[PDB]
Design a binder for this molecule. Structure first.
Ligand SMILES: *[C@@H]1O[C@H](CO)[C@@H](O[C@@H]2O[C@H](CO)[C@@H](O[C@@H]3O[C@H](CO[C@H]4O[C@H](CO[C@H]5O[C@H](CO)[C@@H](O)[C@H](O)[C@@H]5O)[C@@H](O)[C@H](O[C@H]5O[C@H](CO)[C@@H](O)[C@H](O)[C@@H]5O)[C@@H]4O)[C@@H](O)[C@H](O[C@H]4O[C@H](CO)[C@@H](O)[C@H](O)[C@@H]4O[C@H]4O[C@H](CO)[C@@H](O)[C@H](O)[C@@H]4O[C@H]4O[C@H](CO)[C@@H](O)[C@H](O)[C@@H]4O)[C@@H]3O)[C@H](O)[C@H]2NC(C)=O)[C@H](O)[C@H]1NC(C)=O
Ligand SMILES: *[C@@H]1O[C@H](CO)[C@@H](O[C@@H]2O[C@H](CO)[C@@H](O[C@@H]3O[C@H](CO[C@H]4O[C@H](CO[C@H]5O[C@H](CO)[C@@H](O)[C@H](O)[C@@H]5O)[C@@H](O)[C@H](O[C@H]5O[C@H](CO)[C@@H](O)[C@H](O)[C@@H]5O)[C@@H]4O)[C@@H](O)[C@H](O[C@H]4O[C@H](CO)[C@@H](O)[C@H](O)[C@@H]4O[C@H]4O[C@H](CO)[C@@H](O)[C@H](O)[C@@H]4O[C@H]4O[C@H](CO)[C@@H](O)[C@H](O)[C@@H]4O)[C@@H]3O)[C@H](O)[C@H]2NC(C)=O)[C@H](O)[C@H]1NC(C)=O
Ligand SMILES: *[C@@H]1O[C@H](CO)[C@@H](O[C@@H]2O[C@H](CO)[C@@H](O[C@@H]3O[C@H](CO[C@H]4O[C@H](CO[C@H]5O[C@H](CO)[C@@H](O)[C@H](O)[C@@H]5O)[C@@H](O)[C@H](O[C@H]5O[C@H](CO)[C@@H](O)[C@H](O)[C@@H]5O)[C@@H]4O)[C@@H](O)[C@H](O[C@H]4O[C@H](CO)[C@@H](O)[C@H](O)[C@@H]4O[C@H]4O[C@H](CO)[C@@H](O)[C@H](O)[C@@H]4O[C@H]4O[C@H](CO)[C@@H](O)[C@H](O)[C@@H]4O)[C@@H]3O)[C@H](O)[C@H]2NC(C)=O)[C@H](O)[C@H]1NC(C)=O
Ligand SMILES: *[C@@H]1O[C@H](CO)[C@@H](O[C@@H]2O[C@H](CO)[C@@H](O[C@@H]3O[C@H](CO[C@H]4O[C@H](CO[C@H]5O[C@H](CO)[C@@H](O)[C@H](O)[C@@H]5O)[C@@H](O)[C@H](O[C@H]5O[C@H](CO)[C@@H](O)[C@H](O)[C@@H]5O)[C@@H]4O)[C@@H](O)[C@H](O[C@H]4O[C@H](CO)[C@@H](O)[C@H](O)[C@@H]4O[C@H]4O[C@H](CO)[C@@H](O)[C@H](O)[C@@H]4O[C@H]4O[C@H](CO)[C@@H](O)[C@H](O)[C@@H]4O)[C@@H]3O)[C@H](O)[C@H]2NC(C)=O)[C@H](O)[C@H]1NC(C)=O
Ligand code: G39
Ligand code: G39
Ligand code: G39
Ligand code: CA
Ligand code: CA
Ligand code: CA
Ligand code: CA
Lengths: 388, 388, 388, 388
């Protein structure tokens, strides 16, 4: 087998079709489904799998009480087959920790997990299911990474890390790995003022990451990585179509090199595909809470600060809870181009639903089509009443 | 490996022997068995598996309440090993939707699922476990397909779709796929007046489909497809041995090019093997409800409008519930000929058994023998009392 | 790969060591373990597995009520990994029926299941997980076979069938299969007066079967099969060490060509290894019920009607329930000789324990050693109280 | 494939990172997790797995009542995937018994289980999942072995056995196996006065074992094995840093060739890595009970009777229960050196927590890093209240 090379461009995106859905909370009502959060999707050359951070307990288990908690010693990055629920019996543990990333380079899979206390966290880099390299905290304030898949080109896999305050200036680094070993790291450069939880995809030798400004911005920071030169730039999506949550209402002029103001000290992991006229943005429908999800076709959103939507598709109704969202692609599919995909985390439980004492999620997943397909909406589908 | 070619004919069918039975409802009384309906069977070159449409919940789970419902966002086409029950832990998801078909071409498996609202449904074609082609609704009225396996010849797999009214003229299309890509489609031709849920099998370069007239007929429409020329004809089974449900009593003269009247706006998925003197028809024993199942040897049923049974075998007693039935064959078995097989869906729960609030099924499956074997009857075997 | 040839002899048997134990009833108290009976063990070239007849329900499931019943449509021959319990999720179904046999020929596995009503039963022969041949009842009175593994030599696998009364003269046949196809069958010959449930093993081109006389004898009938000439002889074990159950007390003179009298119309499946001075017999400790199990070294038991034990080993205490027992060997192990093995069925529930309404079993399994090893006793270990 | 050779040395150990954690007791609160004790970790060339002695029951199962019991017929050595819990459905049984060891030689895995009554125990040696050799008790007093992995060099695998009193002089033997067959055994030599439960690792053609003196010593005996000459020596760790439990307080002078006094007739399985200046010792934090665990860097602990710690890392807080600990290494990882690993058994239930009637454990596992990583603490994480 061989190192994957990013030689293709994105397929024309004319709509989105259903790709995967696990119905985890529905099924977990009467089965041994693991409590999770921060899910994502990542492909191997022969298989696509769901990924998430387990809480080391099932939903019906009494230890699910208090799983709104983010970081603990009982968390672990798990993977399981596409569209099946994350269960005790069908889940494979990749590594131990409460923040993670993962990707296949064509030959083997690299997985990274971060664990530890807030002032002494450390990352372990696994490659081919063995631990290979370790990274200590450099700012002693919750070392953390992407919570979705990384991308590899010719065996080189860039990973975005952040260490420091979640609500002020922090220390963001881009690490370049090959076979789990560290080739290089560099401090964040460019005009982006704060970076959390980057969603990445690869196209024609370039890697694009769409991130979360948890400090002052409701526009999304963007990191463009050159995986061959191992260099990067950063800015914001210039579009006045704001895609963080919570967020102000859409203005008529966006900001390219500074945060759009109005909401401080919060955000949500999100994604975008930035491809000239083929540009699609995702966001929650609500401007106030993590409910609803929609895709919006915004031509040149990355560079045009007046750009507005010309097409869209609803993924989750506003009346239904959403959550994190992120990008992935099957880089080993057939065809001349890469088909854009994404997932949406459907959070159930706390804080929004405090009749139960747990927090979990299920997953819905979509891929692009060149057809103009009809749309549906994909709620989690569980009824809280049944869990009382 | 290679594309399968339909070079063989049917084996002489002298009786039927038991092939598979999963006892899903019995076992699901105390295990994590998924609620399903619309099951079928399909073989790979190395394995035969059960298939069905899951409801995204187990039977004991509270979310099984209301699963008489046909189309929802929690449904998915699943497969699992022959004669095992469909459980949360042993089931593999093929694709997401509430109407489906699937077949192996010798090299890889094609699976098709349809999802969406009634006026905006769309089909996704998977090949080798990756999405490859999409089809939008053309009549905006529940785009739907076979609910049993398709058949492939030299990499070409015909699939019958219907879009439009279930109780009047509708738009039926035959699609021809190769490696998941669309080669051709054509509107329904011939004398068949309404097509639903075709059951297909392949023999000596020809593909035969037996379908359901849900509009006016209680005789079954038949589609004969040429997979090399990618053309087809259609008519009804001429035999006065009527095989839909519900249905009038058997007359002495059948109809070849028009529906046999008496029952409107209903039917059931069924099958037949049409092979001259080796012709066998399946049907429910009751003329009023989905109970009982029998096989009847009706020589030249396809072309002879006076033809009557000369041999038979009871599969399910009239006192026991049945349901959908359909055809499949192991095209990779040894021997000079293909052995005819079929399955019967054994529906339990609503509407017929409303003490419970769920609807599910188990599967019984048979194959042909050249021996004259003794017969048994194969009920689902669950006791509703235990579920109260 | 190649057809296995019986070129080796038995290893010297000086004692027995523990080989496998599944603790099914213990574990099944709080897990989804399938109710079973008639278990056995059979090896592939790369794996050894447990086999049994499932009842299509778990032990905790309410449908376990009445599973003392022998023949039903919910039974199936299942296999699962050595020393694990037979669970819904880890069991593989081989075929459907209520009497069975199975063996690997070196290339692929043949499995045979019999199903149907008492007067119309039929056997289906599976080879390489596909149905290949069918056999109708010839005496219309519960067609039945070995309930333990068959043995193959150069692709030829003899199987002993019985059809007719269980308490009088019946029609016993030896079938010779190759790749699931029937080469030959012949009626029972020799001095054995009644044959049920043969336990077989292979040595130096010869196949030895030890059976159950359910009519008048408490000595065990023996069938010696030549798999190359496809011929056989039969007689009884001449030894006064009687090994059926129930049975008279041991006399000082056994019978070679007629049943030893005193107990009519009952018996239990059992086994022996007949190897001159290396001869070991198994039997229940009790002469009245299926409790206890012991191995006895009885030199020339097959031919010497005065022969008595000179060594022994207790397997199950008399205070503990036993059941069927049978022989198997790993014909693909390393070494110059075949090591003798056996299993004992540990029946729990009805009729002996009627506080519960179910009947099930677990398995204990032993193999021979050339060392003189210490002995233990291996009870099932479940407590009935917990199931109330 | 090939026999592994111990050609490498240990990597410089500057700290420890998290490797694996199964959270078995947490998860087992509402899932079918097997009750276990005496766990360990062992690697194949392509996979690392958890190992433990099952009690033949799940934690929620009523048969978990009384599982503080050490030796019974319902115990078995099981293995399951790294960091998953030991469940009924995902566990593989290696062999039957209540004391065990296991290791891969590069080609295949050898597993050894001991079973039987106290005065008649015997070991069965499995190789490539088949039984190959048997060893009878030589002192008729609980034949017992390592309870963690053995190490192989060029196909030769040394295993340390003990037979006789646990609280006085006993008969310890070192067995040398190849492909499961016995090459040689020799009685214990050197100055070590009592040997139990050796933890072993391999480095540059030498095998080091750290054991438990259950008689008079609170310093740990050490066995150094030459696997090529098949010879050994023994002594104690000279360091005044005492690593058994319970134990006196640390003095300023240790003992090299005799037990350090103060605590009799007890101990705990433990480990050490003895590598000159790269020497790390493990021990419980408490001197009185099995709570807490810490690693201490003690230069030349093996030979220097004045040596004291110069660096350390806390693994489990003193407020949390610990248990057995032992060594393992991935001998098939990439790099010029072997990375030291270990596990800690986290015992929950009896005797320390007698509100429940069961005894079980979970596992935490660590590996060495050349980075100076921040430390966390890794408790089992279950709440006993939930099990009442
Ligand atoms: C079966 O399925 C199909 C396939 O899915 C369904 O068809 C889909 O239907 C949906 C819903 O209608 C469509 O999504 C919307 O698309 C519009 C954009 O399309 C319109 O506008 C285009 C651009 O117009 C401008 O530019 C052109 C220059 O070329 C100029 O001509 C024009 O005058 C104008 O200047 C048009 O080109 C386009 O026409 C085309 O499409 C028509 C069909 O749609 C067709 O008839 C035409 O012939 C032509 O082919 C069309 O007119 C998006 O604007 C819209 O997104 C807004 O609205 C949703 C609510 O629905 C909202 O959630 C979005 O966030 C967004 O609204 C916010 O953002 C704006 C920008 O910032 C802001 O200005 C708004 O005020 C609003 O802001 C507020 O809400 C947000 C959200 O909380 C908040 O953050 C803010 O702060 C503020 O509070 C939808 O995405 C699909 O495009 C369409 N797909 C296809 C293929 O047709 C079909 O309906 C189904 N059938 C059935 C029976 O159900
Ligand atoms: C052990 O197992 C074996 C193997 O399974 C068992 O043997 C099987 O037994 C079953 C049950 O008896 C048989 O099934 C029935 O078969 C008959 C057909 O066989 C008969 O008819 C043949 C044709 O006769 C005509 O043509 C010939 C020309 O050659 C002419 O000679 C003759 O006079 C007549 O003109 C005969 O050839 C055939 O003879 C052969 O077989 C005999 C044994 O069967 C043997 O003795 C002979 O020597 C010779 O070898 C035989 O006489 C089917 O007709 C029948 O199906 C009808 O009946 C069932 C109810 O049992 C019903 O459910 C069916 O739907 C059907 O009845 C409906 O359809 C008709 C056609 O439309 C209609 O006219 C009826 O009025 C009826 O319609 C009503 O009900 C339906 C259903 O709801 C409804 O829709 C309608 O509207 C209306 O309300 C059975 O299939 C097997 O063939 C047989 N197998 C074998 C290999 O023998 C054995 O019994 C078991 N042993 C034990 C101890 O249990
Ligand atoms: C640690 O583990 C080891 C290894 O397992 C344990 O050692 C084992 O211990 C067991 C139990 O003691 C032994 O099993 C018994 O073996 C005897 C046979 O061995 C004796 O007899 C031999 C033959 O003697 C005759 O021939 C020779 C000619 O060479 C002649 O010299 C002699 O005088 C006599 O004529 C002797 O060779 C043999 O000696 C050897 O072994 C000795 C140790 O055993 C050793 O000390 C010697 O130096 C020499 O090396 C020995 O004396 C079996 O007969 C016996 O089986 C009977 O008894 C059990 C009950 O225990 C019963 O269940 C059996 O069914 C059987 O009894 C029935 O069958 C008879 C035949 O029909 C009948 O006559 C009886 O009346 C009885 O019938 C009644 O009960 C049955 C059952 O319900 C019923 O069906 C009937 O109708 C009727 O009601 C045992 O199998 C192992 O052999 C032995 N293994 C080894 C390697 O030593 C050790 O004990 C453990 N240690 C500890 C501390 O626990
Ligand atoms: C983020 O994570 C990092 C990484 O983990 C954290 O950093 C770690 O912090 C821990 C905790 O502080 C450290 O573990 C302790 O290490 C000390 C040893 O280090 C000290 O001593 C060294 C040796 O000093 C001697 O020799 C040198 C000669 O070179 C000489 O210079 C010196 O004067 C003296 O003679 C020093 O070299 C060393 O300095 C280095 O490290 C410093 C940072 O640690 C740094 O500042 C320096 O510049 C230099 O680089 C340092 O001073 C261990 O001694 C200690 O272990 C004892 O204490 C724990 C309790 O904490 C106890 O459980 C242990 O069992 C042990 O105590 C017992 O054993 C003794 C020996 O027998 C005995 O004498 C004691 O009385 C005691 O005995 C009692 O308790 C036991 C236990 O029950 C019982 O059995 C007895 O009977 C009796 O009752 C710790 O292991 C790590 O080393 C350190 N790692 C690193 C890389 O720095 C960091 O804290 C985290 N950050 C945050 C914010 O949380
Ligand atoms: C420490 C700041 C960080 C990103 C803003 O908080 C995240 C936000 C979360 C959220 O907004 O739901 C949940 C994340 N699990 C959490 N990440 C970590 C490592 O705890
Ligand atoms: C929309 C008409 C269609 C065929 C008549 O209804 C079917 C009949 C069913 C039935 O008769 O039981 C159940 C099918 N799940 C359903 N198919 C869909 C797509 O909903
Ligand atoms: C027989 C002495 C032996 C070592 C001291 O006891 C062990 C100590 C144990 C313990 O200290 O927790 C549990 C072990 N399961 C047990 N080993 C056996 C074979 O029973
Ligand atoms: Ca923000
Ligand atoms: Ca109809
Ligand atoms: Ca008898
Ligand atoms: Ca001690």
């Amino acid at each position: 087998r061989n190192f994957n090379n990013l030689t293709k461009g994105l397929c024309t995106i004319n709509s989105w079709h259903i790709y995967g859905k696990d119905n985890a909370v529905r099924i977990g009502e009467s089965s041994d489904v693991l409590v999770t959060r921060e899910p994502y999707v990542s492909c191997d050359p022969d298989e696509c799998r769901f990924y998430a951070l387990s809480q080391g307990t099932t939903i019906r288990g009494k230890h699910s009480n208090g799983t709104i908690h983010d970081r603990s010693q009982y968390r672990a990055l798990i993977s399981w087959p596409l569209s099946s629920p994350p269960t005790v019996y069908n889940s494979r543990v990749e590594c131990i920790g409460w923040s993670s990333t993962s990707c296949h380079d064509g030959k083997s899979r690299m997985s990274i997990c971060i664990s530890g206390p807030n002032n002494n966290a450390s990352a372990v880099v696994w490659y081919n299911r063995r631990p290979v390299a370790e990274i200590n905290t450099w700012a002693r304030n919750i070392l953390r990474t992407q919570e979705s898949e990384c991308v590899c080109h010719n065996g080189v896999c860039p990973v975005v890390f952040t260490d420091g305050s979640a609500t002020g200036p922090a220390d963001t680094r881009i690490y370049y790995f090959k076979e789990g070993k560290i080739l290089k790291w560099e401090s964040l450069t460019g005009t982006a003022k704060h970076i959390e939880e980057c969603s990445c995809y690869g196209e024609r030798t370039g890697i694009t990451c769409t991130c979360r400004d948890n400090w002052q911005g409701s526009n999304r920071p963007v990191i463009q990585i050159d995986p061959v030169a191992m260099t990067h730039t950063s800015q914001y999506i210039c579009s006045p179509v704001l895609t963080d949550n919570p967020r102000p209402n859409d203005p008529n002029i966006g900001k390219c090199n500074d945060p759009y103001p109005g909401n401080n000290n919060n955000g949500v992991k999100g994604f975008s595909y930035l491809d000239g006229a083929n540009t699609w943005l995702g966001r929650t429908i609500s401007t106030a809470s993590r409910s609803g999800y929609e895709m919006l076709k915004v031509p040149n959103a990355l560079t045009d600060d007046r750009s507005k939507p010309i097409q869209g598709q609803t993924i989750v109704l506003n009346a239904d809870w959403s959550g994190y969202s992120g990008s992935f692609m099957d880089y080993w599919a057939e065809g001349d181009c890469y088909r854009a995909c994404f997932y949406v985390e459907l959070i159930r439980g706390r804080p929004k639903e405090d009749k139960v004492w747990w927090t979990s999620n299920s997953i819905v997943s979509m891929c692009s089509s060149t057809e103009f397909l009809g749309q549906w909406n994909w709620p989690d589908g569980a009824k809280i009443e049944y869990f009382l």
